[PDB]
């Protein structure tokens, strides 16, 4: 990144004020005392009306706003605490201690950063305790391009508050010192709208390491708060800390929140998992479904399934209510809607076939009327439905067209070519055969959409798409190099044939020469040596050189590259069809009306505590492997 002005500067890029910053940096105590006396006497020699203002302009930098207190804290030495006790005592007789401890940068990239923001970051618990006990602001919002970047490489976002700075830098002794302070606003929201619990989700990691202080900071702040105000708070985008963990793909944080159970009464009401009974490996629990089920707009189940930015959707959709809601919707409507979508579309491809095969060749019942009117209606049903999904779609397709958004185009292109064949055939035109045949060939080719979501057949549609997009299209630029180079080369040697006998040279034009050289590449060629040219040996040299390069080397090079794609999909094949069915379920739920979706709703009302009635889900879990390993070491 770049900021065009440093935070601290001690190297110059090629007199009372400049010596004070050169005294608080190295740690010269006896020099700093002699310099402050020279500035204490320099207040009254010309005026006594402006004492509190003139004392501040000689201790602050006029370009950044950095004070002499900030300069001592940016440069940590073992003589640091002695400098702070002198500078805070110097503002006592001048009565300027109120504005000296609450100063901030006036520069646009570090605006709002105070001396308390530096002392907590340098791990100075004794110095930060002296500032708060003197009048430092515990609610100072450090804005700016450095503290509020646009990406995670152009600064450092922690939450803009001193409570979020100690929480993100693993310092719980300062968090306990700030939460006991009665002027600290815990539920404060920064420029992003994030509170103390949104900012911990942002700095969290995606997987489980050895030390997880973010989960420890999440539990410590939430239980000492003792309310739901930090959890129901939404951002400027309208996201809770539960929904933010699903958006950014933090599976360890999303697992902890969504099965949080507190056994202690006076603290039990802050739970989302409620175990009813347990007997060995069998447990019965109640799970909160407040923002999880798809009854609100931006629900957690809708985020995780449609989150193409992240890599761990299979880890997050295995979690504790998310796998059961996804399974119960399949056994109620989504298996029925997938079977009928197969049946109405397989009947649609047969009717396209039997009107394309039995077309009126030269001369130009109730079941025949039932067939052709079904073609005109079902093609308009797809072109409206798939046309909305393309319009409601963003142009950054590198992550959505993996297996998902590729089918939204080919069902739409096939539906338009059926409709375009109607306008051509009826009016006056003969180009209907060019549109009806290509729609029928693409119509049968779209039957591989119904192989998706199954353990045995789900990986075949991914193998076809990933070979085309990642192996074949990047290999056309290697092969057209040799197809167009040798194509003009062999066509230039062919002499103009004497008048008759058009089968005297197959390479007699550039359009001819590309055809046979494509046949030598795939192996349907002919090494003809008749070939009436003035250079028979030179034609025979470049013809065999083409066969060795394309057929022997470049053809088997592509097969070795396509074979690496097939084995990579086959290793991930158990994770593919589980993510294919998960998107198929939620698209079928959006096709349902409101009166029918209300019958399909899961959940029952519970009595958690006094004035607490939330929507639950009873999930009977049995864990044999986790039980046998648990019992074994209690009696080793």
Ligand X SMILES: CCCCCCCC/C=C\CCCCCCCC(=O)O[C@@H](COC(=O)CCCCCCCCCCCCCCC)COP(=O)([O-])OCC[N+](C)(C)C
Binding residue numbers for Na(+): 523
Single out the residue of 168, 269, 159 nearest to residue 217, CA to CA: 168
Write the binding mask 423 to 452 for ligand ACD: x where contact by CB under 6 A, - elsewhere: -------------------x--x--x----
| Residue in 346, 423, 613, 624 binding ligand X, rule: CB under 6 A | 346
Rounded Cα gap, residues 258 and 277, in angstroms? 19
Shortest distance, position 288 Cβ to ligand ACD, whole Å:
39
Beta carbon nearer to ligand X, 343 or 634: 343
Rounded Cα gap, residues 134 and 373, in angstroms? 84
Q: Is 34 exposed, middle or buried (0-12, 13-18, 19+ CB in 10 A)?
A: exposed
Beta carbon nearer to ligand ACD, 468 or 522: 468
Shortest distance, position 560 Cβ to a second copy, whole Å:
4
Rounded Cα gap, residues 25 and 9, in angstroms? 11
If phi over 0 gives left and psi between -120 and 50 gives alpha, with beta otherwise, what is residue 238?
left
Single out the residue of 616, 61, 49, 98 nearest to residue 320, CA to CA: 616
Shortest distance, position 428 Cβ to ligand ACD, whole Å:
24
Q: Decide if residue 465 touches ligand ACD (CB under 6 A).
A: yes
Rounded Cα gap, residues 176 and 221, in angstroms? 9
Beta carbon nearer to a second copy, 387 or 508: 508
- 483 three-state secondary structure: helix
Shortest distance, position 191 Cβ to ligand ACD, whole Å:
44
Rounded Cα gap, residues 321 and 250, in angstroms? 16
Shortest distance, position 172 Cβ to a second copy, whole Å:
7
Q: Is 268 exposed, middle or buried (0-12, 13-18, 19+ CB in 10 A)?
A: middle
Q: Decide if residue 510 touches a second copy (CB under 8 A).
A: yes
Residue 269 binding target from a second copy, ligand FZ4, ligand ACD, none, CB below 5 to 8 Å by type:
none
Beta carbon nearer to ligand X, 13 or 530: 530
Binding range to ligand X, per CB under 6 A, among 108-116, 269-277, 473-481, 616-624: 473-481
- Tokens 């092969």 correspond to 479
Rounded Cα gap, residues 337 and 450, in angstroms? 12
Q: Is 339 exposed, middle or buried (0-12, 13-18, 19+ CB in 10 A)?
A: exposed
Rounded Cα gap, residues 298 and 302, in angstroms? 7
Question: What residues make contact with ligand FZ4 under the rule CB under 6 A?
Answer: 314, 317-318, 323, 326-327, 330, 337, 340-341, 344, 381-382, 385, 411, 578-579, 581-582, 591
Residues 310-369 that bind a second copy (CB under 8 A): 353, 356-357, 359, 361-362
Write the binding mask 381 to 410 for ligand ACD: x where contact by CB under 6 A, - elsewhere: -----------------------------x
Q: Decide if residue 373 touches ligand X (CB under 6 A).
A: no
Write the binding mask 250 to 289 for a second copy: x where contact by CB under 8 A, - elsewhere: ------------------------x-xx-xxxx-x-x---
Residues 72-111 that bind a second copy (CB under 8 A): 74
- Backbone φ and ψ of 606, nearest 5°: -115, 165
Q: Decide if residue 573 touches ligand ACD (CB under 6 A).
A: no
Shortest distance, position 307 Cβ to ligand ACD, whole Å:
23
Q: Is 566 exposed, middle or buried (0-12, 13-18, 19+ CB in 10 A)?
A: middle
């Amino acid at each position: 990144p770049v900021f065009s002005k440093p935070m601290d500067s001690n190297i110059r890029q090629c007199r009372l004020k400049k010596r004070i910053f050169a005294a608080v940096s190295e740690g010269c105590v006896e020099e700093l005392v002699e310099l402050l006396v020279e500035l204490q006497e320099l207040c009254r020699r010309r005026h006594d009306e402006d004492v509190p203002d003139f004392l501040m302009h000689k201790l602050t930098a006029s370009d950044t706003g950095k004070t002499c207190l900030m300069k001592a804290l940016l440069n940590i030495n073992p003589n640091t605490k002695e400098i702070v006790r002198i500078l805070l005592a110097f503002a006592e007789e001048n009565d300027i201690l109120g504005r000296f401890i609450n100063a901030e940068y006036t520069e646009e990239a570090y605006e709002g950063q105070t001396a308390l923001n530096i002392a907590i970051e340098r791990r100075q618990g004794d110095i930060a305790a002296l500032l708060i006990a003197a009048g430092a602001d515990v609610n100072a919002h450090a804005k700016g391009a450095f503290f509020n970047p646009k990406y995670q490489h152009e600064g450092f976002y922690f939450g803009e508050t001193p409570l979020a700075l100690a929480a993100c830098t693993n310092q719980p002794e300062i968090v306990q010192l700030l939460m006991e302070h009665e002027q600290t606003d815990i539920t404060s929201r920064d420029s992003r709208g994030n509170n103390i619990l949104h900012a911990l989700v942002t700095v969290a990691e995606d997987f489980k390491t050895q030390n997880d202080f973010v989960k420890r900071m999440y539990d410590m702040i939430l239980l000492r708060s003792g309310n739901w105000e930090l959890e129901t708070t939404r951002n400027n985008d309208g996201l809770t800390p539960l929904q933010l963990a699903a958006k950014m793909g933090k599976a360890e944080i999303l697992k902890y929140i969504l099965s949080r159970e507190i056994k202690e009464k006076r603290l039990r009401s802050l739970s989302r998992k409620f175990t009813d009974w347990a007997y060995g490996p069998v447990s019965s629990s109640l799970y909160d479904l407040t923002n999880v089920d798809t009854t609100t707009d931006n629900s957690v189940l809708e985020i995780t399934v449609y989150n193409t930015n992240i890599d761990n959707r299979h880890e997050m959709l295995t979690l504790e209510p998310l796998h059961t809601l996804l399974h119960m919707k399949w056994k109620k409507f989504a298996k029925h809607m997938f079977f009928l979508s197969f049946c109405f579309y397989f009947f649609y491809n047969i009717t396209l076939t039997l009107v394309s095969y039995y077309r009126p060749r030269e001369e130009e019942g109730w079941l025949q009327l039932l067939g052709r009117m079904f073609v005109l209606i079902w093609a308009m049903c797809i072109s409206v439905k798939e046309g909305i999904a393309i319009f409601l779609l963003r142009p950054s397709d590198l992550q959505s067209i993996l297996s998902d958004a590729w089918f939204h185009f080919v069902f739409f292109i096939q539906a338009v070519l059926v409709i375009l064949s109607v306008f051509l055939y009826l009016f006056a035109y003969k180009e209907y055969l060019a549109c009806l045949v290509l729609a029928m060939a693409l119509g049968w080719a779209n039957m591989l959409y119904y192989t998706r979501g199954f353990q045995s057949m789900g990986m075949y549609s991914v193998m076809i798409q990933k070979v085309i997009l990642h192996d074949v299209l990047k290999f056309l630029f290697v092969y057209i190099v040799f197809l167009l180079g040798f194509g003009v080369a062999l066509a230039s040697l062919i002499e103009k044939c004497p008048k008759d006998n058009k089968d005297c040279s197959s390479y007699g034009s550039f359009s001819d020469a590309v055809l046979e050289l494509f046949k030598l590449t795939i192996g349907l060629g002919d090494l003809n040596i008749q070939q009436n040219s003035k250079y028979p040996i030179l034609f025979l040299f470049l013809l065999i050189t083409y066969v060795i390069l394309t057929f022997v080397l470049l053809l088997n090079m592509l097969i070795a590259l396509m074979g690496e794609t097939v084995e990579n999909v086959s290793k991930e094949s158990e994770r593919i069809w589980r993510l294919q069915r998960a998107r198929t379920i939620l698209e079928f739920e959006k096709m349902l009306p409101e009166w029918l979706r209300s019958r399909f709703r899961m959940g029952e009302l519970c009595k958690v505590a006094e004035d607490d009635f939330r929507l639950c889900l009873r999930i009977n879990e049995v864990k044999w492997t986790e039980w046998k390993t648990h019992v074994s070491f209690l009696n080793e």
